[PDB]
A paper describes a structure:
We then assembled the GPR88-Gi1 complex with scFv16 (a Gi-stabilizing antibody) in the presence or absence of 2-PCCA, and obtained the cryo-EM density maps of the two complexes at a global nominal resolution of 2.4 Å and 3.0 Å, respectively. As the 2-PCCA-bound structure has higher resolution, we used this structure for the following analysis. Remarkably, 2-PCCA binds to a pocket formed by the cytoplasmic ends of TM5 and 6, as well as the extreme C-terminus of the α5 helix of Gi1, an allosteric binding site that has not yet been reported in other GPCRs. The excellent electron density enabled unambiguous modeling for the 2-PCCA molecule in the allosteric binding pocket. The majority of the contacts between 2-PCCA and GPR88 are mediated by hydrophobic interactions. The R2 moiety of the allosteric 2-PCCA inserts into a pocket created by TM5, TM6 and the α5 helix of Gi1, and the ortho-nitrogen in the aromatic ring forms hydrogen bond interaction with the backbone NH of G2836.34. In addition, the primary amine of R1 forms a hydrogen bond with the backbone carbonyl of S2826.33. In addition, the map of the 2-PCCA-bound complex also reveals putative densities for three cholesterol molecules, which locate on the side of the 2-PCCA molecule. Remarkably, the allosteric 2-PCCA also participates in the hydrophobic network by interacting with both the Gi1 α5 helix and TM5-TM6 of GPCR88, which may further stabilize the interface of the GPR88-Gi1 signaling complex and lead to the slight shift of Gi1. We find that 2-PCCA is an allosteric agonist that binds to the herein identified allosteric site and directly involves in the interaction with G-protein, which further stabilizes the signaling complex, contributing the high activity of GPCR88.
Residue numbers in the entry:
A (entry chain A): 4 to 53, 182 to 233, 241 to 354
B (entry chain S): 1 to 121, 124 to 235
C (entry chain B): 4 to 340
D (entry chain R): 37 to 86, 113 to 180, 191 to 228, 280 to 352
E (entry chain G): 8 to 63
The structure:
């Protein structure tokens, strides 16, 4: 019933459909990461180890990661955060040394609480980076952690202070049954950060596959 | 720069074989369906074969089916026509024609320069009663074409195409689907008509317009051309 | 100087009383005698199944046959509505598209989003492929909306609180509209294209003159961000959809709100708004996943378009008024009639 | 009595097909094998709910049920273990449809082109069940091992219960049948009582098929809650 | 902030100078337009399948 030109148009549409399917398959096997941070919290260094939105693409162990940084996207965040619903993971950067002032750790905690409990990231696991290990280690011996956390009750040492900060950040999340938080202290600069991100991403992908299979 | 260059034509003994090549340049070759059109030394156009985008669909004229093979190398931007068992009736100039098919598109928009091949010694019928008609610059003339079957389709399209072949030049698309002016064609040319009866009107005819006007139907394959109306003076 | 702030408040009170004196009879009272439209039962005549991510924008072509849809899968698709065929599939450099437009002539489409750039694509080239004509840069925030004035002019809405009028051939901001205090989310050209109205996150709508580039009027009444805006067919009024689960109709000459379209059981936001050819029906997309049809003159819900499994993000009506296209956060466009 | 279980089986299977069809948009290719097995399962449950044709059709239902178990197990094993590129190429839309149809075509051929008693039929059925069981155990254990490595690597709630429950039930419902078939395999006397009991367990597996596949599936749980509620 | 305050005050002054009509007149005009185009609104008045481009 179709005309010759109608048949040719249908064939062209078919070809377009095939190309769209191929592109979707290519995109479905890529790891989408959303990079977030309160400010100069170490986003730049982690991007280095690898306008508005900035996309960084890198391949690690045959896995392609697209990491989107929205630091320059200055505007209402609730009007475009839903655009990132379904990303493979969120990488949250926190300056472990930004506790004295200026309060900065409290702002980072507020942003982490807002993002983790966001309605669009219920099932999206977050990878927590605690940058500036060395500077925080030097500062802890001089400026006690009590400035930021008066309720803190422990020795003013690097290990215990870092553990307390990590525990507070991990407990800031409410839905502990539908998402996971992977915490790392990123100052090694020995390719350990990318390995940790890869491990967390593989774990998240396996969990998602299990959910799809109904195991889950 | 959207040229199509054909090569591989020449003297071939009857019953032999020959492959015609067509190198495309300056456009997305893989996105266009390609046609081979033939013109005897002193006759009108005759559609030969068609290969769709992606090579999914192929069509041949009943007078070449089984003998000719149409193929394309998309990465190489080349179109091929493999001819076997060539006869004296195959002597003609072969034109490489690109055509893209989507809603509102303009098929048969660009024709190649042609390559000459010389062999040593149910179809819809399109009629052009006026084989020739003298014309003078500044006057208005109308070319008449008739179809044995209604070219109007149930979707509203009337699949009639008008081509102009100036002396010593490749055919040029003027009007597609009986009403639409091809890109780069002046507003003087006009196409109108109903099913089985179509007219091409030229207003204020001038130089560069003398030649043979061909009417083609794209309602169904094989694509058939009219005899061709010649303008002179 | 606090005196200037006091004077602004006094002027704000003055204009409020000025438009208060003109409110003699409400629209509801005027339209209380006309018969209701009854029930609008629209069926899904077509479903478009090409996109693979959330669809954020769609726009009808002036021919009422070709529509362009934008999805975050990184593709602009031009559909032939009658036959469902895909005419074109344009891959975008930035996949974070938020807006789409279709030049009235049909030769171009526009795209934009989180890249802060409005990309113009040439649909009719001698090469047979869609090509990027221009990339309009200058906005410091995401591209909220864009609408062609002609083949060489386009007005863009941006999340950086400003709207701009561009000269495509030169790619420069011919005019900048800076009156808002929050992100501008929607944009609607008047029928004569002599002006346009924008809705922003400051819960206000502003009327701009494109020739002079100056906020002619400001409209308030909404309680949250305005996400959608669409002028009346007459051009003397427009409708806004906001996050407070309410749509309202504003009249330019009256300079105040005319009607409010809300229901007790609707508590979600409005994502898109459009009018019927006659302006009697106001179609609004919701986060309920179903579009709502309102009697624009009586503020009575006339029908529901429940055919999407996710948020209805975009909504458009053909120029001839034959059909309505709805896109949602699922990967499907639906055509109703 | 026992027929009550058949009633529950058809209702359980019917819901799974209804949920998959109703939410076809929200159900992926993985559920295609689950629904295919559930349909075959409906065929078996219905017959026993509430004759040469009855026996012949029942044989078709069981073999598809058992074959669908392997397809579901293989699909889960390949999705969780193989790389996405290989999984995508293998499980194309046309490939998934072909795999489903081939299971029915293979099932129909075996029923019509074989002697029924379940000699050569008895020896074959026993061999097939061991091959079916071996693949099921290999696929699900592989999923258990892979999911154990990832947790250990990232570590530096009954979990995996579904994979334990399915494999335990499959073996306890199917083992008696194959043992009987291997015994009927050589010249030995098989009391009618055990033969009837063995078939009850194998057919009972079809009734519990829909639960074992989807009980832990959160999307199915949400779907069930919304419709029921 | 003084420059911004003056700009806003000047903008508001332009707003107050607009000529406004009665809401009843504005409402009547919208009613008149809808009635004058009711027959040309296929969505408001469903059309038979003969001339419906979207059938099926
Ligand atoms: C014929 C019996 C065949 C059989 C036998 C055992 C299992 C099995 C084994 C271990 C595990 N365990 C441990 C507990 N949690 C287990 C005893 C609690 C039920 C795990 O941590 C494994 C990683 C989890 C996983 C595997 C697959 C999918 C999702 N999650 C679970 C199941 C399965 C089949
Ligand atoms: C004739 C045979 C097949 C009868 C049944 C054999 C079954 C019960 C045997 C064979 C292989 C065994 C499995 C071998 C490996 C594992 C993985 C380990 O993490 C848990 C025990 C588990 C899961 C065993 C469970 C029992 C097992 C499944
Ligand atoms: C044939 C069927 C119906 C009988 C019951 C089989 C299943 C349900 C039984 C058999 C062995 C049981 C398991 C034995 C050991 C463990 C480890 C413990 O940490 C959690 C419970 C768990 C995992 C049991 C769960 C239930 C179990 C898996
Ligand atoms: C056919 C049936 C009745 C016998 C074999 C299945 C049941 C009964 C037995 C055989 C092998 C057993 C499993 C062997 C290994 C493990 C891993 C351990 O970390 C939890 C218990 C678990 C999961 C056992 C559960 C019970 C088990 C599954």
């Amino acid at each position: 019933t179709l005309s010759a030109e109608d048949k040719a148009a249908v064939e062209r549409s078919k070809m377009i459909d095939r190309n769209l399917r191929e592109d979707g398959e290519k995109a479905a096997r890529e790891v989408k990461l959303l990079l977030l941070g309160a400010g100069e919290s170490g986003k730049s260094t982690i991007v280095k180890q690898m306008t508005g939105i900035v996309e960084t693409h890198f391949t690690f162990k045959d896995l392609h990661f697209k990491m989107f940084d929205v630091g320059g996207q200055r505007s209402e965040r609730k009007k475009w955060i839903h655009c990132f619903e379904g990303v493979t993971a969120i990488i949250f950067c926190v300056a472990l040394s930004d506790y004295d002032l200026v309060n900065r750790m409290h702002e980072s905690m507020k942003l982490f609480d807002s993002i983790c409990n966001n309605k669009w990231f219920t099932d999206t696991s977050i990878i927590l980076f605690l940058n500036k290990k060395d500077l925080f280690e030097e500062k802890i011996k001089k400026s006690p952690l009590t400035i930021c956390y008066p309720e803190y009750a422990g020795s003013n040492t690097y290990e215990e202070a870092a553990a307390y900060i990590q525990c507070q950040f991990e407990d800031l999340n409410k839905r502990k049954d539908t998402k996971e938080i992977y915490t790392h202290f990123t100052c090694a600069t020995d390719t350990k950060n990318v390995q940790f991100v890869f491990d967390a991403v593989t774990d998240v992908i396996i969990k998602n596959n299990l959910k799809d299979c109904g195991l889950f | 720069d959207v040229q199509l260059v054909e090569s591989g034509g020449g003297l071939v003994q009857p019953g032999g074989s020959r492959k015609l090549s067509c190198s495309a340049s300056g456009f997305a070759f893989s996105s266009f369906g390609m046609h081979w059109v033939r013109q005897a030394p002193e006759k009108g156009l005759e559609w030969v074969a068609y290969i769709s985008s992606g090579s999914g669909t192929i069509y041949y004229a009943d007078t070449v089916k089984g003998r000719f093979t149409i193929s394309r190398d998309d990465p190489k931007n080349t179109l091929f026509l493999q001819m076997t068992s060539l006869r004296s009736e195959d002597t003609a100039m072969y034109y490489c024609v690109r055509s893209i098919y989507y809603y509102g598109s303009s098929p048969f928009d660009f024709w190649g320069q042609g390559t000459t091949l010389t062999v040593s010694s149910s179809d819809i019928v399109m009629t052009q009663a006026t084989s020739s008609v003298p014309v003078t610059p500044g006057e208005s003339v109308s070319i008449s074409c008739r179809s044995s079957k209604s070219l109007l389709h149930s979707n509203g399209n009337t699949y009639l195409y008008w081509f102009l072949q100036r002396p010593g030049q490749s055919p040029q698309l003027l009007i597609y689907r009986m009403s639409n002016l091809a890109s780069g064609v002046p507003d003087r040319f006009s196409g109108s008509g109903s099913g089985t009866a179509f007219t091409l009107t030229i207003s204020r005819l001038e130089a560069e317009d003398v030649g043979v006007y061909y009417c083609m139907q794209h309602l169904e394959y094989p694509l058939t051309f009219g005899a061709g109306t010649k303008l002179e003076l | 100087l606090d005196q200037l702030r006091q004077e602004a408040e006094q002027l704000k009170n003055q204009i409020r009383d000025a438009r208060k004196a003109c409110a003699d009879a409400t629209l509801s009272q005027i339209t209380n005698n006309i018969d209701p439209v009854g029930r609008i039962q629209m069926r899904t005549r077509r479903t478009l199944r090409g996109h693979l991510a959330k669809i954020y924008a769609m726009h009808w072509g002036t021919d009422s046959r070709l529509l362009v849809s934008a999805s975050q899968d990184g593709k602009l698709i031009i559909w032939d509505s009658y036959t469902t065929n895909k005419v074109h599939a344009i891959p975008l450099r930035s996949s974070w598209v938020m807006t789409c437009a279709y030049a009235p002539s049909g030769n171009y489409v526009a795209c934009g989003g989180l890249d802060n750039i409005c990309s113009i694509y040439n649909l009719k080239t001698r090469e047979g492929n869609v090509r990027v004509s221009r990339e309009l840069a200058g906005h410091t925030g995401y591209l909220s909306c864009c609408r062609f004035l002609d083949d060489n002019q386009i007005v863009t809405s941006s999340g950086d609180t400003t709207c701009a009028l561009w000269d495509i051939e030169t790619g420069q901001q011919t005019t900048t509209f800076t009156g808002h205090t929050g992100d501008v989310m929607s944009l609607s050209l008047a029928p004569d294209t002599r002006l346009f109205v924008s809705g922003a996150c400051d819960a206000s709508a502003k009327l701009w003159d494109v020739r002079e580039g100056m906020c002619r009027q400001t409209f308030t009444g909404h309680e949250s961000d305005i996400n959608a805006i669409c002028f009346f067919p007459n051009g003397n009024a427009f409708a806004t959809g906001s996050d407070d689960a309410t749509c309202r109709l504003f009249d330019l000459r009256a300079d105040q709100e005319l009607m409010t379209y809300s229901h007790d059981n609707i508590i979600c936001g409005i994502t898109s708004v459009s009018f019927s050819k006659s302006g009697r029906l106001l179609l609004a997309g919701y986060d309920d996943f179903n579009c709502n049809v309102w009697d624009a003159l009586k503020a009575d819900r006339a029908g529901v378009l429940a055919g999407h499994d996710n948020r209805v993000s975009c909504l458009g009506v053909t120029d001839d008024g034959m059909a309505v296209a709805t896109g949602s956060w699922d990967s499907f466009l639906k055509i109703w009639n | 009595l026992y027929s009550g279980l058949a009633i529950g089986g058809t209702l359980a299977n019917g819901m799974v097909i209804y949920l998959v069809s109703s939410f076809r948009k929200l159900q992926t290719t993985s559920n295609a094998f689950i629904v295919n097995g559930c349909a075959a399962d409906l065929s078996v449950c219905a017959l026993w709910m509430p004759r040469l044709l009855r026996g012949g059709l029942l044989g078709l239902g069981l073999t598809v049920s058992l074959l669908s178990h392997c397809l579901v197990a293989l699909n889960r094993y390949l999705l969780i273990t193989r790389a996405p590129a290989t999984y995508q190429a293998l499980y194309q839309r046309r490939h998934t449809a072909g795999m489903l149809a081939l299971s029915w075509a293979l099932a129909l051929g075996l029923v019509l082109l074989l002697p029924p008693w379940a000699h050569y039929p008895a020896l074959l059925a026993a061999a097939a069940l061991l091959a079916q069981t071996a693949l099921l155990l290999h696929c699900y254990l592989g999923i258990v091992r892979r999911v154990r490595v990832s947790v250990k690597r990232v570590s530096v709630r009954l979990s995996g219960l579904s994979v334990l429950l399915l494999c335990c039930v499959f073996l306890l419902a199917t083992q008696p049948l194959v043992w009987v078939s291997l015994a009927s395999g050589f010249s030995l006397p098989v009391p009618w009582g055990v033969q009837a009991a063995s078939w009850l367990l194998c057919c009972a597996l079809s009734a519990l098929n829909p639960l074992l596949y989807t009980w832990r599936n959160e999307e199915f749980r949400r779907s069930v809650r919304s419709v029921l509620p | 902030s003084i420059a911004q305050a003056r700009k806003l005050v000047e903008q508001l002054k332009m707003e107050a100078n607009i000529d406004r009509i009665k809401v009843s007149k504005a409402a009547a005009d919208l009613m008149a337009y809808c009635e004058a185009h009711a027959k040309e609104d296929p969505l408001l008045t469903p059309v038979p399948a003969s001339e419906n481009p979207f059938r099926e």
